[PDB]
Design a protein around this ligand. Structure first.
Ligand SMILES: [Cl-]
Length: 108
């Protein structure tokens, strides 16, 4: 098993699922949840578990934080033309059912 990053097909559903998980989770200093517009790039790394590195475009959603629960389906972009590019790293330990956001960094 190599230690490096392996580039994936970014259009896979599981990666969109993970992108929403990471984005829905960024709630500091906002009135609204941000949401995912697009998954541009994906890289995985085998550690004691799996690292997912997602390059995504995000946009503010219609869902107000603390007013509703986040869902991909409900929380569409206010305006999907207003995009920001971020890199999210998710650490997954499948046998403990744990996902954490290692880092979430927006170029903008
Ligand atoms: Cl690394």
């Amino acid at each position: 098993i190599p230690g490096g990053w392996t580039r994936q097909d970014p259009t896979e559903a599981r990666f969109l699922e993970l992108a929403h998980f990471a984005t829905s989770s960024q709630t500091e200093g906002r009135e609204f949840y941000d949401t995912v517009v697009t998954v541009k790039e994906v890289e995985t790394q085998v550690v004691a578990g799996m690292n997912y590195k997602l390059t995504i475009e995000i946009s503010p959603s219609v869902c107000k934080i603390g007013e509703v629960q986040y869902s991909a389906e409900q929380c569409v972009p206010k305006d999907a033309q207003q995009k920001s590019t971020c890199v999210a790293v998710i650490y997954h330990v499948p046998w403990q059912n744990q996902k954490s956001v290692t880092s979430y960094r927006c170029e903008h």
